[PDB]
Design a binder for these strands. Sequence first.
DNA 1: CGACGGATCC
DNA 2: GCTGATGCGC
DNA 3: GGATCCGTCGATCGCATCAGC
Length: 276
Amino acid sequence: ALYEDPPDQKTSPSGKPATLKICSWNVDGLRAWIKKKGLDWVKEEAPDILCLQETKCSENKRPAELQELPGLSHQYWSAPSDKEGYSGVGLLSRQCPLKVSYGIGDEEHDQEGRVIVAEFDSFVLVTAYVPNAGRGLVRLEYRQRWDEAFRKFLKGLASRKPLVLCGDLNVAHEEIDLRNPKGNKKNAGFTPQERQGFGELLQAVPLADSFRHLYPNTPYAYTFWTYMMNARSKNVGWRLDYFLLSHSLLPALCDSKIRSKALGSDHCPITLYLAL
DNA sequence: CGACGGATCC
DNA sequence: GCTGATGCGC
DNA sequence: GGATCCGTCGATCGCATCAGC
Ligand SMILES: [Mg+2]
């Protein structure tokens, strides 16, 4: 069955207007995504903050078009030192953050280019490209060890401000989060191990899944479709991209969107509206 | 990772 | 410099 | 004997490198 995201709710449950719009997008190659007009879509979306995953692009190769975003002028990029053309994340912001950091602790010695932390006035934003378990699960144990390290890193954040975590967390939490749950229970992204790590992330930090909090029983809402077999045209997909929020931020939550129609990648964008 | 073929379930 | 093949990861 | 379960197979993409010219 196809899916149509509901209209943008730009007002908090108590009636407060949204003041902050965050967009997150696994672009599956920054240079290719720009050629497929991804940046034209970002301009129409006009977010205050834009988070990108899988940029696959070093610091010298970023297209000029990107610097020329005047409403997103503060930009922070990280790529892995070893595997250029792999991973890579970015964070673009209207206002300048108070602090930006990279990685989950040892980045200066282990530059993986998967995590950016940006502290703002009233909240901390983490965007993440979570490592894949791999075809045939060959890196699943590494993913479980990474999940645990990431969990610990997020819990032990010095700042007492609430947390927004977004990006490609590379797991469909529950059966409602993908089209073919039973056929995928031993595939990367829906193993019991990755699902349990997601549940432990929510409990340990603690965090709430913004989209599922608002739409707890809505099926067929996905953010990824394999390029192959025309999966996107049949909406055979997985929800892999999330906005996870501190409990204190839930009254500020206006809406959590899935931008199903925006092309340019095998993921589509997600967008958060907060009344801060 | 979806499609597909083959086995098992009542 | 440019194309297309191959390898790799996802 | 329709529905479900489960293991196998080949499918798209972006980017790096390499061969060739
Ligand atoms: Mg990907």
